[PDB]
C-alpha cells in the first residue's frame, strides 16, 4: 500500500495528547529540548507506542475502581477491560501531562439512578509516591467519600505542581509512571533534536488552568491524532529514511514549505535562520506526501 | 484529476470497539436498532454523505465536536454563540455553530471556563444549566439561555455538556436522545438542518452506534446516545472524497480472529447503515464489538441482505 497522509487542513486536525483542535505549529523554545510523550506516538507504518490510542475516543481518559473511603483508583482500560500491570506505563489513552496537578472530573458508570449529579471532583499529584500507574493505581489528594464503583472521567483543568513549591507547569515533560522499586516498562522512547539544521515540529493546543506566567497552558504533541488513526488503518510500509511532505495552501495549491516525516512518527523542518520556522505559516494548509527520501536529502529552509 | 475521479471507495480498517461516537467524543459501546421500528431520526451531528459532504452541524473531526463557545456579560443569562475557534457564527446559514450539541429532550449541565487563561491561580470552571425547550434556546438565532444569572466576569467562554438529566418541563417526562432540540423559534425555524433519516422498510432497519453519556433518567439506565456513523468514517470520507459509484456500499462485519462474516450491512450514500434483523429480538446488538466493517462491493438499493443475528 502506498503511503499517504490525511487530506485535511491542519487547523481542523486534533492534538494527540488531548482531544482538541490544533491551534499552532511550533519549534521547541529550547533548541535542545528532548521529548518523551507517551501519547501521540505512532510509527508511520501504524505501530502505536507508549500509551497511544488508535483514535480520539480512548484518548485522555481515566477509568478504574475505587472504594468508598479510599484514596486509590485502581486502573482499568477505558473500556473496562483489566489493565495488565508491569507491561505498559499506563492504560491506553491515560494522560501524559507531566509537571502539573490534575483536577479531574469522574462519575460512576453505568448510570443506575433516576436523579442526581453524578460528577465528582478529585485531584491528582503526579510526582508523589502514590502516583504509580505502571503498577495499576493512582492516588487522589483526598479520601474519596462517595459510593464504591467503576469510575470514568478525565482531567478538566491543570495547575502548578504542589511540590516542589513555586515550580511552574511544564507540559514538555511526562509524569513519573514508575514506582519506588520499579521503573515503568515499555515507555515510548525519547525523541532527540535532529541537528544538521533540522528541528522538530510540535502541534500545540491550549488546555484550561492557571500557571506562573498567567498565560495559556500550551500542550505540544508530535502528530495530529488523525494521522495516527490513518496510519493504523493504512499500515503502509516505510520505504525511505523519511517521507518528504509539502505543506500546501489548498486555496492556491502553493507549496508553503518542505517537511520530513520520519519513520519514528515525528516531523522536522529546516528553519531559515532565527525568527523563521513553521510558526510563521498559516494553519489552513494541508500536508501532502511527495516522495520517500534518503538520509542524504537536505530540506529547503522554511 | 483522473485519480480523484477514479478514487476507490474505502472505510477505515479499525475494529468497531476502537471507533468513536459522532454525537459526542467517546468510544462506541454497542450497535442497536431503534426500539420503535418506525423511528425517524434527524441528528445534526454525525451526518456526512459517503463522498465526504458534511451535513447539519457535523465537524470533519472530533476536535470540534460537542463544544460550545460564546460571549456572556456578567449578570446576564444569554450566551452569544461563536464557532469553536472563536470566529463569528453566521446565523441563518446553519442550525448552530459547527459541533454544537444536538441532544434533544434533556436538560444540559455544562462546564465552561473563560478563555484564554490570564491567571496564576484559581479554579476557572463554571457550572451552568441549559433547558432546550424554552423560549431562550435559539442557537439558530445565535444564542442560548442559562437557567440562572451568570455572576462571573464578562468574557469569552468555552466548554461542553458534562452530564444530562430529564427535561425540567413537562415535569416527569424522560430523556429522549432519539430527538434533537428545536434550534430556531416560532418566528424563525432553523435553516439548513440535516434532513431526516427514515426507516428503509422491506426488511431493512437502521443501525445505530451507541455510547453512554453521564446522568440519570427515569429508567435508571445508561443514557445511550445513538449516532449514524463512527466519527472516523466521517473524517475518512472528508479526506478521501471517493466518488459514490452505486446505490449502496455492501459491508461485511468481519471477525478479525476467524475472517468469517458476522453480518451483512448496506451503507447508503446519505451516510447511514442498514441491516436485516433475523426475526423479532434479533439484530446487530448480538454481534461482538471487535469486528471490522469491510467494503465488499457497490450494490443496487434492491440488493437483499442476509439476515443478521438470532431470534
Ligand atoms: C489548597 C488551595 O486551595 N491552595 C491555593 C491557595 O489557597 C489559599 C491560600 C491561603 C489561604 N488563606 O490564607 O486563608 C486560603 C486559601 O491559594 C493559592 C493562591 O491563590 C493557590 O495557588 C493554591 O492553589 C494550589 O496551588 C498549588 C501550587 O502551589 C497547586 O497548583 C494546587 O493544585 C492548587 O490548588 C488548586 O487550586 C485552588 C485554587 C483550589 O481550587 C484547589 O482546590 C485546587 O486543588
Ligand atoms: C432544582 C433541583 O435541584 N431539582 C432536583 C430536586 O432538588 C431538590 C428537591 C427538594 C428540595 N427541597 O426539599 O428543598 C430541594 C432541591 O431533587 C430531585 C430528586 O429528589 C431531582 O430530580 C431534581 O433534579 C432536577 O430534575 C429535573 C427533572 O424533574 C431536571 O432533570 C433538572 O435538570 C434536575 O436538576 C439537576 O439535578 C439536580 C440533582 C441538581 O444537580 C441541579 O443543579 C441540576 O440542575
Ligand atoms: Na510514580
Ligand atoms: Na428553540
Amino acid at each position: 500500500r502506498a503511503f499517504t497522509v490525511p487530506n485535511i487542513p491542519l487547523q481542523t486536525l486534533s492534538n494527540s495528547r488531548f482531544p482538541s483542535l490544533i491551534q499552532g505549529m511550533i519549534l521547541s523554545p529550547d533548541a535542545s529540548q528532548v521529548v518523551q510523550f507517551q501519547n501521540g506516538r505512532c510509527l508511520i507504518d501504524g505501530q502505536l507506542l507508549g500509551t497511544t490510542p488508535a483514535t480520539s475516543g480512548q484518548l485522555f481518559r481515566v477509568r478504574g475502581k475505587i472504594n468508598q473511603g479510599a484514596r486509590t483508583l485502581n486502573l482499568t482500560e477505558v473500556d473496562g477491560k483489566p489493565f495488565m500491570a508491569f507491561d505498559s506505563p499506563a492504560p491506553v489513552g491515560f494522560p501524559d501531562f507531566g509537571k502539573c496537578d490534575w483536577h479531574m472530573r469522574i462519575s460512576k458508570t453505568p448510570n443506575n439512578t433516576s436523579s442526581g449529579d453524578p460528577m465528582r471532583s478529585v485531584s491528582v499529584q503526579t510526582n508523589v509516591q502514590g502516583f504509580v500507574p505502571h503498577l495499576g493505581s493512582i492516588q487522589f489528594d483526598e479520601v474519596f467519600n462517595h459510593p464504591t464503583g467503576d469510575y470514568i472521567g478525565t482531567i478538566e483543568w491543570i495547575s502548578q505542581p504542589s511540590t516542589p513549591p513555586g515550580t511552574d507547569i511544564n507540559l514538555w515533560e511526562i509524569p513519573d509512571y514508575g514506582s519506588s522499586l520499579s521503573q515503568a516498562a515499555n515507555l515510548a522512547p525519547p525523541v532527540f533534536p535532529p541537528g544538521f539544521g533540522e528541528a522538530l515540529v510540535y502541534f500545540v493546543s491550549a488546555f484550561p488552568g492557571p500557571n506562573n506566567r498567567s498565560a495559556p497552558n500550551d500542550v505540544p504533541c508530535l502528530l495530529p491524532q488523525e494521522y495516527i488513526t490513518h496510519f493504523v488503518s493504512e499500515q503502509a510500509p516505510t520505504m525511505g529514511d523519511a517521507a518528504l511532505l509539502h505543506y500546501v495552501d489548498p486555496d492556491t495549491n502553493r507549496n508553503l514549505g518542505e517537511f520530513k516525516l520520519y519513520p519514528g512518527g515525528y516531523l522536522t523542518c529546516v528553519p531559515n535562520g532565527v525568527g523563521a520556522g513553521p510558526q510563521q505559516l498559516p494553519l489552513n494548509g494541508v500536508f501532502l506526501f511527495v516522495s520517500w527520501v534518503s538520509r542524504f536529502y537536505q530540506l529547503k529552509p522554511v
Side-chain angles (χ1 to χ4, degrees), chain A residues 27-232:
Chain A
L27 308 172
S28 57
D30 187 340
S32 72
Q33 183 76 57
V34 180
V35 299
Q36 197 172 3
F37 313 140
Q38 294 303 301
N39 290 323
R41 303 295 303 274
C42 188
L43 306 182
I44 67 177
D45 62 12
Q47 176 65 68
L48 302 169
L49 310 175
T51 58
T52 300
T55 66
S56 287
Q58 215 171 345
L59 182 61
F60 204 69
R61 272 80 160 182
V62 179
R63 184 169 183 170
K65 309 297 193 300
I66 183 154
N67 296 131
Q68 183 171 93
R71 289 178 63 190
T72 302
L73 185 70
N74 292 296
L75 301 169
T76 62
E77 301 291 342
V78 175
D79 69 347
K81 290 181 172 69
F83 170 61
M84 316 295 279
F86 290 107
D87 196 71
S88 219
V92 176
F94 188 84
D96 74 350
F97 286 14
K99 294 295 175 72
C100 60
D101 277 11
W102 296 356
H103 304 107
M104 305 187 66
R105 297 281 279 183
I106 61 175
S107 68
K108 187 176 171 293
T109 194
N111 175 63
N112 61 3
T113 77
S114 62
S115 64
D117 176 355
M119 305 311 304
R120 310 293 174 251
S121 295
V122 299
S123 295
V124 175
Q125 294 175 236
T126 64
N127 66 334
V128 295
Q129 193 167 303
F131 190 83
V132 287
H134 101 285
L135 292 186
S137 70
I138 61 176
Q139 194 169 132
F140 301 161
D141 281 357
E142 296 291 316
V143 171
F144 189 77
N145 293 135
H146 303 290
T148 298
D150 186 351
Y151 284 79
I152 187 159
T154 189
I155 305 166
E156 181 179 56
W157 62 287
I158 58 178
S159 65
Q160 301 94 326
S162 285
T163 63
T167 56
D168 202 6
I169 295 182
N170 186 2
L171 293 158
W172 294 94
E173 291 184 20
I174 55 162
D176 190 353
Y177 295 86
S179 55
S180 48
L181 284 315
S182 294
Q183 282 191 9
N186 287 147
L187 286 162
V191 183
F192 291 89
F196 300 102
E198 292 183 19
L200 289 160
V201 179
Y202 301 92
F203 305 98
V204 290
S205 307
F207 194 86
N211 55 47
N212 290 354
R213 293 158 41 247
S214 305
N217 286 132
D218 288 325
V219 181
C221 73
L222 292 168
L223 284 183
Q225 183 63 44
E226 292 80 7
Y227 278 39
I228 297 172
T229 305
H230 188 66
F231 302 153
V232 168

Side-chain angles (χ1 to χ4, degrees), chain A residues 204-275:
Chain A
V204 290
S205 307
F207 194 86
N211 55 47
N212 290 354
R213 293 158 41 247
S214 305
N217 286 132
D218 288 325
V219 181
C221 73
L222 292 168
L223 284 183
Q225 183 63 44
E226 292 80 7
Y227 278 39
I228 297 172
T229 305
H230 188 66
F231 302 153
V232 168
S233 179
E234 292 282 303
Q235 297 159 53
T238 294
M239 294 188 174
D241 188 71
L244 178 68
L245 312 184
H246 286 172
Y247 185 65
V248 184
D249 189 349
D251 296 329
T252 58
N253 287 313
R254 194 217 299 177
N255 176 20
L256 303 165
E258 293 191 352
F259 293 74
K260 275 178 183 178
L261 174 60
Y262 282 91
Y266 50 86
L267 268 179
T268 69
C269 68
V270 174
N272 198 23
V274 291

